[PDB]
Coordinates of C-alpha atoms and ligand atoms in Angstrom, one line a residue:
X1 CA -145.4 -71.0 88.4
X2 CA -148.7 -69.0 88.7
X3 CA -151.3 -70.1 86.1
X4 CA -151.8 -66.4 85.3
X5 CA -150.2 -63.0 86.3
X6 CA -152.5 -60.0 85.8
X7 CA -151.9 -56.2 85.1
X8 CA -155.1 -54.6 86.4
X9 CA -156.4 -53.9 82.9
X10 CA -159.9 -55.3 82.7
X11 CA -161.3 -58.0 80.4
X12 CA -163.4 -55.8 78.1
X13 CA -166.4 -56.5 75.9
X14 CA -166.5 -56.0 72.0
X15 CA -170.3 -55.2 71.9
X16 CA -173.0 -54.5 74.5
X17 CA -173.7 -57.5 76.7
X18 CA -177.3 -58.3 77.7
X19 CA -177.5 -59.7 81.3
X20 CA -181.3 -60.3 81.6
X21 CA -183.4 -62.7 79.6
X22 CA -185.2 -60.6 76.9
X23 CA -188.9 -61.2 76.8
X24 CA -191.1 -62.0 73.8
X25 CA -194.4 -63.9 73.7
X26 CA -192.9 -67.1 72.2
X27 CA -190.0 -67.3 74.7
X28 CA -192.4 -66.6 77.6
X29 CA -194.6 -69.5 76.3
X30 CA -191.7 -71.8 77.1
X31 CA -190.5 -70.1 80.4
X32 CA -192.2 -67.4 82.5
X33 CA -189.8 -66.9 85.4
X34 CA -187.5 -64.7 83.3
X35 CA -185.8 -63.0 86.3
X36 CA -184.2 -66.4 87.2
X37 CA -182.4 -66.5 83.8
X38 CA -179.2 -64.5 83.2
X39 CA -176.2 -64.3 80.8
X40 CA -172.6 -64.1 82.1
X41 CA -170.8 -61.0 80.9
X42 CA -167.4 -59.2 81.2
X43 CA -168.8 -57.6 84.4
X44 CA -167.9 -60.8 86.4
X45 CA -164.5 -61.5 84.6
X46 CA -162.6 -60.3 87.8
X47 CA -164.4 -62.9 89.9
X48 CA -163.4 -65.6 87.5
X49 CA -159.7 -64.4 87.3
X50 CA -159.4 -64.9 91.1
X51 CA -160.6 -68.6 90.9
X52 CA -158.4 -69.5 87.8
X53 CA -155.2 -68.0 89.2
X54 CA -153.1 -70.2 91.4
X55 CA -149.7 -71.8 91.8
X56 CA -149.2 -75.4 90.6
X57 CA -147.7 -78.3 92.5
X58 CA -146.2 -80.9 90.3
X59 CA -144.4 -84.0 91.6
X60 CA -144.2 -86.8 89.1
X61 CA -143.5 -90.4 90.2
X62 CA -142.9 -93.8 88.7
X63 CA -146.6 -94.5 88.1
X64 CA -146.8 -91.3 86.0
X65 CA -143.6 -92.1 84.1
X66 CA -144.8 -95.7 83.4
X67 CA -148.0 -94.4 81.9
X68 CA -146.2 -91.7 79.8
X69 CA -143.9 -94.4 78.3
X70 CA -147.0 -96.5 77.3
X71 CA -148.6 -93.4 75.7
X72 CA -145.4 -92.5 73.7
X73 CA -145.1 -96.1 72.5
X74 CA -148.8 -96.0 71.3
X75 CA -148.3 -92.6 69.6
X76 CA -145.4 -94.1 67.5
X77 CA -148.0 -96.2 65.6
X78 CA -149.7 -93.0 64.2
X79 CA -149.1 -91.5 60.8
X80 CA -150.5 -87.9 60.6
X81 CA -150.4 -85.6 57.7
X82 CA -150.2 -81.8 57.2
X83 CA -153.5 -80.3 56.1
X84 CA -153.5 -77.9 53.1
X85 CA -154.5 -74.3 53.8
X86 CA -157.7 -75.0 51.9
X87 CA -158.7 -78.0 54.1
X88 CA -157.8 -76.0 57.3
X89 CA -159.9 -73.0 55.9
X90 CA -162.9 -75.3 55.4
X91 CA -162.7 -76.6 59.0
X92 CA -163.0 -73.1 60.5
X93 CA -166.3 -72.7 62.3
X94 CA -168.7 -70.0 61.1
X95 CA -168.8 -66.9 63.3
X96 CA -165.4 -67.5 65.1
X97 CA -163.6 -64.3 66.0
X98 CA -162.5 -62.2 62.9
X99 CA -158.8 -61.6 62.3
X100 CA -157.3 -58.2 63.2
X101 CA -155.7 -58.5 59.7
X102 CA -158.8 -57.5 57.7
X103 CA -160.8 -60.8 57.2
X104 CA -163.2 -63.0 59.1
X105 CA -164.4 -66.6 59.4
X106 CA -166.7 -66.2 56.4
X107 CA -163.7 -65.1 54.2
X108 CA -161.6 -68.1 55.6
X109 CA -164.4 -70.6 54.9
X110 CA -164.9 -69.2 51.3
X111 CA -161.0 -69.6 50.8
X112 CA -160.9 -65.7 50.1
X113 CA -157.6 -64.7 48.5
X114 CA -156.9 -62.1 51.2
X115 CA -157.4 -64.6 54.0
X116 CA -155.3 -67.3 52.3
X117 CA -152.4 -64.9 51.6
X118 CA -152.3 -63.8 55.3
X119 CA -152.6 -67.4 56.6
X120 CA -149.7 -68.4 54.3
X121 CA -147.6 -65.6 55.8
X122 CA -148.5 -66.7 59.4
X123 CA -147.4 -70.3 58.3
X124 CA -144.1 -69.1 56.9
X125 CA -143.5 -67.2 60.2
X126 CA -144.1 -70.4 62.3
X127 CA -141.5 -72.2 60.1
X128 CA -139.0 -69.3 60.5
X129 CA -139.4 -68.3 64.2
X130 CA -139.7 -71.0 66.9
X131 CA -139.5 -68.6 69.9
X132 CA -141.3 -65.2 69.8
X133 CA -144.5 -65.4 72.0
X134 CA -147.7 -65.1 69.9
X135 CA -150.3 -62.6 71.2
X136 CA -153.7 -63.8 72.4
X137 CA -157.0 -62.1 73.2
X138 CA -158.8 -62.7 76.5
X139 CA -162.7 -62.4 76.4
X140 CA -165.4 -63.1 79.0
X141 CA -167.7 -65.9 77.6
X142 CA -171.5 -64.9 77.5
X143 CA -173.4 -68.1 78.5
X144 CA -176.9 -68.5 79.9
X145 CA -177.8 -70.0 83.2
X146 CA -180.6 -70.2 85.8
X147 CA -179.8 -68.6 89.2
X148 CA -179.0 -71.3 92.0
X149 CA -179.9 -71.6 95.7
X150 CA -176.5 -72.3 97.2
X151 CA -174.3 -69.6 95.3
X152 CA -174.4 -66.4 90.2
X153 CA -171.6 -68.0 88.1
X154 CA -168.9 -65.6 86.9
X155 CA -168.1 -65.7 83.1
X156 CA -165.6 -68.2 81.8
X157 CA -162.5 -66.7 80.3
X158 CA -161.6 -67.5 76.7
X159 CA -158.0 -67.1 75.5
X160 CA -157.4 -67.4 71.8
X161 CA -154.7 -66.4 69.2
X162 CA -155.7 -64.5 65.9
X163 CA -157.8 -66.3 63.2
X164 CA -154.7 -66.7 60.9
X165 CA -152.8 -68.6 63.7
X166 CA -156.0 -70.7 64.3
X167 CA -156.0 -71.9 60.7
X168 CA -152.3 -72.7 60.9
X169 CA -153.0 -74.8 64.0
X170 CA -155.3 -77.0 61.9
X171 CA -152.7 -77.2 59.1
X172 CA -150.1 -78.5 61.6
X173 CA -152.3 -80.5 64.0
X174 CA -155.8 -81.3 62.9
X175 CA -154.8 -84.7 61.6
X176 CA -152.8 -85.4 64.7
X177 CA -155.6 -84.5 67.2
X178 CA -158.1 -86.5 65.0
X179 CA -156.1 -89.7 65.3
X180 CA -153.9 -89.6 68.5
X181 CA -156.4 -90.0 71.4
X182 CA -158.0 -93.2 69.9
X183 CA -154.5 -94.6 69.2
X184 CA -153.3 -93.9 72.8
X185 CA -156.4 -94.7 74.8
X186 CA -158.5 -97.0 72.8
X187 CA -162.0 -97.6 74.3
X188 CA -161.3 -95.0 77.1
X189 CA -161.4 -92.2 74.4
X190 CA -164.8 -90.6 75.0
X191 CA -165.2 -88.5 71.9
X192 CA -165.5 -91.5 69.6
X193 CA -169.0 -92.3 71.1
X194 CA -172.5 -91.2 70.4
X195 CA -174.8 -90.8 73.6
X196 CA -176.1 -94.4 72.9
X197 CA -172.6 -95.8 72.6
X198 CA -171.4 -93.9 75.8
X199 CA -174.4 -95.3 77.8
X200 CA -173.6 -98.9 76.4
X201 CA -169.9 -98.4 77.4
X202 CA -170.9 -97.4 81.0
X203 CA -173.5 -100.1 81.5
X204 CA -171.2 -102.8 80.1
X205 CA -168.3 -101.5 82.3
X206 CA -170.6 -101.5 85.4
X207 CA -171.9 -105.0 84.7
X208 CA -168.3 -106.3 84.1
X209 CA -167.5 -105.8 87.8
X210 CA -168.4 -108.3 90.6
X211 CA -169.2 -105.4 93.0
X212 CA -168.9 -102.1 91.0
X213 CA -168.0 -98.7 92.4
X214 CA -167.8 -95.7 90.2
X215 CA -167.0 -92.0 90.5
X216 CA -166.6 -88.8 88.4
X217 CA -163.5 -86.7 89.2
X218 CA -163.9 -83.0 89.1
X219 CA -160.6 -81.2 88.6
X220 CA -160.6 -77.6 89.9
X221 CA -160.2 -75.3 86.8
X222 CA -158.5 -78.0 84.7
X223 CA -157.0 -75.6 82.1
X224 CA -155.2 -73.7 84.9
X225 CA -153.8 -76.9 86.4
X226 CA -152.1 -77.8 83.0
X227 CA -148.4 -76.9 83.5
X228 CA -145.7 -75.8 81.0
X229 CA -144.1 -79.3 81.4
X230 CA -147.5 -81.0 80.7
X231 CA -147.8 -78.9 77.5
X232 CA -144.2 -79.7 76.5
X233 CA -145.0 -83.4 77.2
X234 CA -148.0 -83.2 74.8
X235 CA -145.6 -81.7 72.2
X236 CA -143.2 -84.7 72.7
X237 CA -146.2 -87.2 72.3
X238 CA -147.3 -85.4 69.0
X239 CA -143.7 -85.8 67.7
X240 CA -143.8 -89.6 68.3
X241 CA -146.1 -89.8 65.2
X242 CA -144.8 -90.2 61.7
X243 CA -145.2 -86.5 60.7
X244 CA -144.3 -84.3 57.7
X245 CA -141.1 -82.2 58.2
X246 CA -142.9 -78.8 58.1
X247 CA -145.5 -80.1 60.6
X248 CA -142.7 -81.0 63.0
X249 CA -141.3 -77.4 62.9
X250 CA -144.8 -75.8 63.1
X251 CA -145.8 -78.0 66.1
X252 CA -142.6 -77.0 68.0
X253 CA -143.2 -73.3 67.2
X254 CA -146.9 -73.4 68.2
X255 CA -145.9 -75.2 71.5
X256 CA -143.2 -72.7 72.5
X257 CA -144.8 -69.5 71.2
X258 CA -148.4 -70.2 72.1
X259 CA -149.4 -73.4 73.9
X260 CA -147.0 -73.1 76.8
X261 CA -148.1 -69.6 77.6
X262 CA -147.9 -66.0 76.4
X263 CA -149.2 -62.5 76.8
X264 CA -152.9 -61.7 77.2
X265 CA -154.5 -58.7 75.5
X266 CA -158.0 -57.4 76.0
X267 CA -160.4 -56.3 73.2
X268 CA -159.1 -52.7 73.6
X269 CA -155.5 -53.7 72.9
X270 CA -154.4 -53.4 76.5
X271 CA -151.9 -55.8 78.2
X272 CA -154.0 -57.9 80.6
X273 CA -151.4 -60.2 81.9
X274 CA -149.5 -63.4 81.1
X275 CA -150.6 -67.1 80.9
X276 CA -148.5 -70.2 81.9
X277 CA -151.3 -72.8 81.5
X278 CA -153.7 -74.1 78.9
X279 CA -155.3 -71.5 76.5
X280 CA -159.0 -72.4 76.3
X281 CA -159.3 -71.4 72.6
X282 CA -156.5 -73.4 70.9
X283 CA -156.9 -76.4 68.6
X284 CA -155.1 -78.7 71.2
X285 CA -157.4 -77.8 74.2
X286 CA -159.7 -80.8 73.8
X287 CA -157.1 -83.3 72.6
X288 CA -154.4 -82.1 75.1
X289 CA -156.9 -82.1 78.0
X290 CA -158.1 -85.6 77.0
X291 CA -154.5 -87.0 76.8
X292 CA -153.2 -85.2 79.9
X293 CA -156.3 -86.2 82.0
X294 CA -155.9 -89.8 80.8
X295 CA -152.2 -90.0 81.7
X296 CA -152.7 -88.5 85.2
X297 CA -155.8 -90.5 85.9
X298 CA -154.4 -93.9 84.8
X299 CA -151.3 -93.2 86.9
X300 CA -153.4 -92.1 89.9
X301 CA -155.6 -95.3 89.6
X302 CA -152.3 -97.3 90.0
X303 CA -150.9 -95.0 92.7
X304 CA -154.1 -95.6 94.7
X305 CA -154.2 -99.4 93.9
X306 CA -157.7 -99.2 92.5
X307 CA -158.7 -102.6 91.2
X308 CA -159.8 -103.4 87.6
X309 CA -160.4 -99.7 86.6
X310 CA -162.4 -98.9 83.4
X311 CA -162.0 -95.1 82.6
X312 CA -163.9 -92.9 80.1
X313 CA -162.3 -89.5 79.3
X314 CA -163.7 -86.5 77.4
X315 CA -161.3 -83.6 77.7
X316 CA -161.2 -82.8 81.5
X317 CA -164.2 -85.0 82.1
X318 CA -163.2 -88.3 83.9
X319 CA -165.3 -91.2 85.0
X320 CA -163.9 -94.3 86.6
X321 CA -165.7 -97.6 87.3
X322 CA -163.7 -100.2 89.3
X323 CA -164.0 -103.2 91.7
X324 CA -165.2 -102.1 95.1
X325 CA -163.1 -103.2 98.1
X326 CA -165.9 -102.3 100.6
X327 CA -167.2 -98.8 101.6
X328 CA -164.5 -97.8 104.1
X329 CA -161.7 -99.0 101.8
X330 CA -163.3 -97.3 98.7
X331 CA -163.4 -94.0 100.7
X332 CA -159.7 -94.4 101.6
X333 CA -158.6 -95.4 98.1
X334 CA -160.5 -92.4 96.5
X335 CA -158.7 -90.1 98.9
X336 CA -155.4 -91.7 97.8
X337 CA -156.5 -91.3 94.1
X338 CA -157.2 -87.6 94.8
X339 CA -153.8 -87.2 96.6
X340 CA -152.0 -88.7 93.5
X341 CA -154.0 -86.5 91.1
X342 CA -153.1 -83.5 93.3
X343 CA -149.4 -84.4 93.1
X344 CA -149.8 -84.5 89.3
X345 CA -151.3 -81.0 89.2
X346 CA -154.9 -82.1 88.8
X347 CA -156.3 -81.0 92.3
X348 CA -160.0 -81.5 93.0
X349 CA -162.9 -79.0 92.8
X350 CA -165.6 -81.0 94.7
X351 CA -163.9 -84.1 96.2
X352 CA -164.9 -87.3 94.4
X353 CA -167.7 -89.5 95.9
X354 CA -167.8 -93.3 95.6
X355 CA -171.1 -94.3 94.0
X356 CA -172.7 -97.8 94.1
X357 CA -175.6 -97.0 91.7
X358 CA -174.6 -96.1 88.1
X359 CA -177.6 -93.7 87.9
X360 CA -176.1 -91.5 90.6
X361 CA -172.9 -90.7 88.7
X362 CA -172.9 -87.4 86.7
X363 CA -170.3 -87.3 83.9
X364 CA -170.3 -85.0 80.8
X365 CA -173.1 -83.2 82.8
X366 CA -175.3 -86.3 82.3
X367 CA -176.5 -89.6 84.0
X368 CA -177.7 -93.0 83.0
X369 CA -181.4 -93.6 83.3
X370 CA -183.9 -96.3 82.2
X371 CA -187.0 -96.3 80.0
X372 CA -188.8 -99.0 78.0
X373 CA -189.3 -99.2 74.2
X374 CA -192.4 -100.0 72.1
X375 CA -192.0 -103.8 73.0
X376 CA -191.6 -103.0 76.7
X377 CA -187.9 -103.9 76.6
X378 CA -185.5 -102.0 79.1
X379 CA -183.5 -99.2 77.3
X380 CA -180.6 -97.3 79.0
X381 CA -180.2 -93.7 77.8
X382 CA -178.4 -90.5 78.9
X383 CA -180.2 -87.6 80.4
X384 CA -179.5 -84.5 82.6
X385 CA -181.2 -81.9 84.7
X386 CA -183.0 -79.8 82.0
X387 CA -182.6 -76.4 83.8
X388 CA -179.7 -75.0 81.7
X389 CA -181.0 -76.4 78.3
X390 CA -184.4 -74.8 79.1
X391 CA -183.0 -71.4 80.2
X392 CA -180.8 -71.4 77.0
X393 CA -183.7 -72.4 74.8
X394 CA -185.8 -69.5 76.2
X395 CA -182.9 -67.0 75.5
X396 CA -182.5 -68.5 71.9
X397 CA -186.3 -68.0 71.3
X398 CA -186.1 -64.3 72.4
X399 CA -182.8 -63.6 70.6
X400 CA -181.1 -64.6 67.4
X401 CA -177.9 -66.4 68.4
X402 CA -175.0 -67.6 66.1
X403 CA -175.2 -71.1 67.5
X404 CA -178.3 -72.9 68.9
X405 CA -177.8 -75.0 72.0
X406 CA -181.5 -76.1 71.7
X407 CA -180.7 -77.9 68.4
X408 CA -177.6 -79.6 69.9
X409 CA -179.7 -80.6 73.0
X410 CA -182.5 -82.1 70.8
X411 CA -179.8 -84.1 69.0
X412 CA -177.8 -85.3 72.0
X413 CA -180.9 -85.8 74.3
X414 CA -183.5 -86.9 71.7
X415 CA -184.6 -90.0 73.8
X416 CA -185.3 -87.9 76.9
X417 CA -188.8 -87.1 78.2
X418 CA -187.9 -83.3 78.4
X419 CA -186.3 -83.0 74.9
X420 CA -189.3 -84.8 73.3
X421 CA -192.1 -83.2 75.2
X422 CA -190.8 -79.7 75.6
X423 CA -187.9 -78.9 73.3
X424 CA -189.3 -80.6 70.2
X425 CA -192.9 -79.3 70.7
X426 CA -191.7 -75.8 71.5
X427 CA -189.2 -75.4 68.6
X428 CA -191.4 -77.0 65.9
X429 CA -194.2 -74.6 67.0
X430 CA -191.7 -71.6 66.8
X431 CA -190.4 -72.7 63.4
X432 CA -194.0 -73.1 62.1
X433 CA -194.9 -69.6 63.5
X434 CA -191.8 -68.0 61.9
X435 CA -191.9 -70.0 58.6
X436 CA -188.3 -71.4 59.3
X437 CA -188.7 -75.2 59.0
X438 CA -186.4 -75.4 56.0
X439 CA -183.7 -73.0 57.2
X440 CA -180.4 -74.7 58.2
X441 CA -179.2 -73.8 61.7
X442 CA -175.8 -74.1 63.4
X443 CA -175.1 -76.0 66.7
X444 CA -171.8 -76.9 68.4
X445 CA -171.4 -80.2 70.3
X446 CA -168.1 -80.1 72.3
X447 CA -166.5 -77.9 69.7
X448 CA -167.8 -80.0 66.7
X449 CA -169.9 -77.6 64.5
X450 CA -172.9 -78.8 62.6
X451 CA -175.3 -77.2 60.0
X452 CA -178.6 -78.9 60.3
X453 CA -182.1 -78.4 58.8
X454 CA -184.8 -79.0 61.5
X455 CA -186.7 -81.1 58.8
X456 CA -183.7 -83.6 58.9
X457 CA -184.1 -84.2 62.7
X458 CA -186.0 -87.6 62.4
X459 CA -183.4 -89.4 60.1
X460 CA -180.5 -87.9 62.2
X461 CA -182.1 -89.1 65.4
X462 CA -182.9 -92.5 64.1
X463 CA -179.3 -92.9 62.9
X464 CA -177.8 -91.5 66.0
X465 CA -180.0 -93.1 68.8
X466 CA -182.0 -95.7 66.9
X467 CA -185.8 -96.1 66.2
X468 CA -186.5 -96.7 69.9
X469 CA -185.8 -92.9 70.5
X470 CA -189.4 -92.3 69.1
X471 CA -191.1 -94.9 71.3
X472 CA -189.6 -94.6 74.8
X473 CA -192.1 -94.6 77.7
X474 CA -192.2 -95.5 81.4
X475 CA -189.5 -93.1 82.4
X476 CA -188.2 -93.3 86.0
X477 CA -189.9 -91.7 89.0
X478 CA -186.6 -89.8 89.7
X479 CA -186.3 -88.5 86.1
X480 CA -190.1 -87.5 85.9
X481 CA -189.6 -85.7 89.3
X482 CA -186.4 -83.9 88.2
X483 CA -188.1 -82.6 85.0
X484 CA -191.3 -81.6 87.0
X485 CA -189.4 -79.8 89.7
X486 CA -187.4 -77.9 87.0
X487 CA -190.7 -76.8 85.3
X488 CA -192.1 -75.4 88.6
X489 CA -188.9 -73.6 89.3
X490 CA -188.6 -71.9 85.9
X491 CA -192.3 -71.3 85.3
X492 CA -192.5 -73.8 82.3
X493 CA -196.0 -75.2 81.6
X494 CA -196.5 -78.8 82.9
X495 CA -195.9 -81.8 80.7
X496 CA -199.6 -82.4 80.1
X497 CA -200.0 -78.9 78.6
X498 CA -197.0 -79.7 76.3
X499 CA -198.8 -82.9 75.3
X500 CA -201.9 -80.9 74.4
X501 CA -199.8 -78.4 72.4
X502 CA -197.9 -81.3 70.6
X503 CA -201.1 -82.7 69.2
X504 CA -201.7 -79.4 67.3
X505 CA -198.0 -79.2 66.2
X506 CA -198.0 -82.8 65.0
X507 CA -201.3 -82.2 63.0
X508 CA -199.8 -79.0 61.3
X509 CA -196.6 -80.9 60.4
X510 CA -198.6 -83.9 59.0
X511 CA -200.7 -81.5 56.8
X512 CA -197.4 -80.2 55.2
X513 CA -196.4 -83.6 53.8
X514 CA -192.9 -84.7 52.9
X515 CA -190.1 -84.2 55.5
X516 CA -192.4 -82.1 57.7
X517 CA -195.0 -85.0 57.9
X518 CA -192.1 -87.4 58.9
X519 CA -191.3 -84.9 61.7
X520 CA -195.0 -85.0 62.8
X521 CA -195.2 -88.8 62.5
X522 CA -192.0 -89.8 64.2
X523 CA -191.1 -87.0 66.7
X524 CA -194.7 -86.7 68.0
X525 CA -196.0 -90.3 68.0
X526 CA -195.7 -90.0 71.9
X527 CA -198.5 -87.3 71.8
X528 CA -201.3 -89.4 70.3
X529 CA -203.5 -92.2 71.7
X530 CA -203.7 -94.1 68.4
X531 CA -200.1 -94.7 67.4
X532 CA -198.7 -94.8 63.9
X533 CA -196.3 -97.6 63.0
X534 CA -192.8 -96.2 63.0
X535 CA -190.8 -98.0 60.3
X536 CA -187.1 -97.2 59.4
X537 CA -186.9 -93.8 57.6
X538 CA -185.2 -94.3 54.1
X539 CA -183.4 -90.9 54.5
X540 CA -181.7 -92.3 57.7
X541 CA -179.9 -95.0 55.8
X542 CA -178.9 -92.6 53.0
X543 CA -177.2 -90.0 55.3
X544 CA -173.8 -90.1 57.0
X545 CA -173.9 -88.5 60.5
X546 CA -170.2 -87.8 60.9
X547 CA -169.7 -86.2 57.5
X548 CA -172.8 -84.7 55.8
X549 CA -173.6 -82.2 58.5
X550 CA -170.2 -80.9 59.6
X551 CA -169.5 -77.2 59.7
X552 CA -166.1 -77.1 61.3
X553 CA -164.2 -77.7 64.5
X554 CA -162.8 -75.8 67.4
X555 CA -160.4 -77.4 70.0
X556 CA -161.7 -75.1 72.7
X557 CA -164.3 -72.2 73.2
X558 CA -163.3 -69.1 71.0
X559 CA -165.3 -65.9 70.9
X560 CA -168.2 -65.7 68.3
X561 CA -167.5 -62.5 66.2
Ligands
33F1 C1 -160.5 -83.8 67.6 C2 -159.9 -84.5 68.8 C3 -160.8 -84.2 70.1 C4 -160.4 -84.8 71.4 N1 -162.2 -84.4 69.7 C5 -163.2 -83.6 70.1 O1 -163.0 -82.5 70.7 C6 -164.5 -84.0 69.6 C7 -165.7 -83.2 69.9 C8 -166.9 -83.6 69.5 C9 -167.0 -84.8 68.7 N2 -168.2 -85.2 68.3 C10 -168.4 -86.4 67.5 C11 -169.0 -87.6 68.2 N3 -170.3 -87.1 68.8 S1 -171.8 -87.9 68.5 O2 -172.6 -87.6 69.6 O3 -171.5 -89.2 68.0 C12 -172.5 -87.0 67.1 C13 -172.0 -87.4 65.8 C14 -172.6 -86.7 64.7 C15 -173.6 -85.7 64.9 O4 -174.1 -85.1 63.8 C16 -175.3 -84.4 63.8 F1 -175.3 -83.3 64.5 F2 -175.6 -84.2 62.5 F3 -176.3 -85.2 64.3 C17 -174.0 -85.4 66.2 C18 -173.4 -86.0 67.3 C19 -170.2 -85.8 69.6 C20 -169.7 -86.0 71.0 O5 -169.3 -85.0 71.6 N4 -169.6 -87.2 71.5 C21 -169.1 -87.6 72.8 C22 -170.1 -87.5 73.9 C23 -171.2 -88.4 73.9 C24 -172.1 -88.3 74.9 C25 -172.1 -87.3 75.9 O6 -173.1 -87.3 76.9 C26 -174.3 -86.8 76.6 F4 -175.0 -87.5 75.7 F5 -175.0 -86.7 77.7 F6 -174.2 -85.5 76.0 C27 -171.0 -86.4 75.9 C28 -170.0 -86.5 74.9 C29 -169.5 -84.8 68.7 N5 -165.9 -85.5 68.5 N6 -164.7 -85.1 68.9

């Protein structure tokens, strides 16, 4: 079947959509080549529709069936519970699309009586009707990028049911999605790791091979490749768990009425078309993609005969490290891997390339690199080209945004030369200028929402990355050059100018005392010649990373209202 069928009605916006990077003095102090930075808008939705629309080829074989049997057997060990409406309400991210039934995410999060009553009615309907397709909205995601040489990117399309349905999805499945991937995949489950744990996993996997070869596999539009039978298989896996009787009914109803497909409506109420693939804005998008990618990849590894595979899966992101059989055989065996993935309906975007240097693999838009700590010891850490983080940071300085990618980037990429020298220096200077150091900000890391005060960054970073994150030095020539090239391209001041600026920022934070002084001492010790002794921060041991800062969860994109 075709992944989508369209009517000719357009994907329409809700509010005006800015295309060009707005300019203000503070955003310009970070990045001056503003004409290179753009936001995707509904204007390019038609271009995206053409790429995501295609027929699917699915031929399952014994290797696929063997893996599915293992997965169903593993799933049978899981006990998952129904979430109360109240817990499902509290997990709703702030600013997700309001309901068309007279309430928004803020009402849901507050457990407002009107929101709760409507959610209960949607729940009763899922228990009573297992077949009527549930309506979905299609929107063009507005995301910021830097223009490229060999290419602008069209907007991603987000497909989501109404807010009341979204809360019901958490009631029926949040506990299932929270437990099932680890039970099924064990150490291959990517979302259980911090950046430090992911790098440790990759390095250990690489070192475990006699002659390692690794590759990332880029599926062409993964959500569109997911078939009705894949979605019905995910439903069968969920049902292997020990579940509550109403959860079993609601899971079947959500699968048949929503997950397998359904009508697409634009913001103006017009019929846009029909979907027969993964909806990007449902609770099961991340879990379902992780499970389905894992099953297909593990089967394709076996179909290709790849030796001693170690896989790491985060949604549609796949990285495989195996035993090399020589360059010509590896090239042939990767083509066989691709051919099997193609038969399972996971065809390639860019064909995979065998890599013999761990640093040359990009996965979860990042690569392994090396630096040294305060004692000169080698430290592996995750980094990435800083172009998109910098372009987004400049937009977020010029415009108030609901979610701050800069904050998520400082958190995830705290040990990096670019996040420390540029992002921390810039944002702490902006927060000082605007008197906003104490205000909590939202960020989203692969759908996990967090509410964080900038003044809590040092204990959060210590707990997440370790004390070495404040002492890394001797970054690689390749890493230094990639950051330097990015700065010249975007019109960002050179690292030595940021170093000069950080000395003033660090001094201002120190003068404020308390948490602010800890920000100056720890985050900016790289900027001074005479170093301060960085001892473990007491607040780092007191906090809980996973639990104190959560502000909800989304399984996939969803429009910010
Ligand atoms: C529900 C079922 C589905 C399948 N699950 C999900 O969809 C899902 C989605 C997100 C998510 N989390 C928790 C673990 N981490 S975490 O980093 O430990 C962390 C913990 C607390 C924290 O709190 C603070 F914000 F307060 F600090 C901040 C961060 C984040 C993460 O995405 N990790 C993987 C990863 C690691 C490195 C990568 O590479 C590079 F580093 F390059 F980005 C890329 C991905 C966010 N967990 N689950």
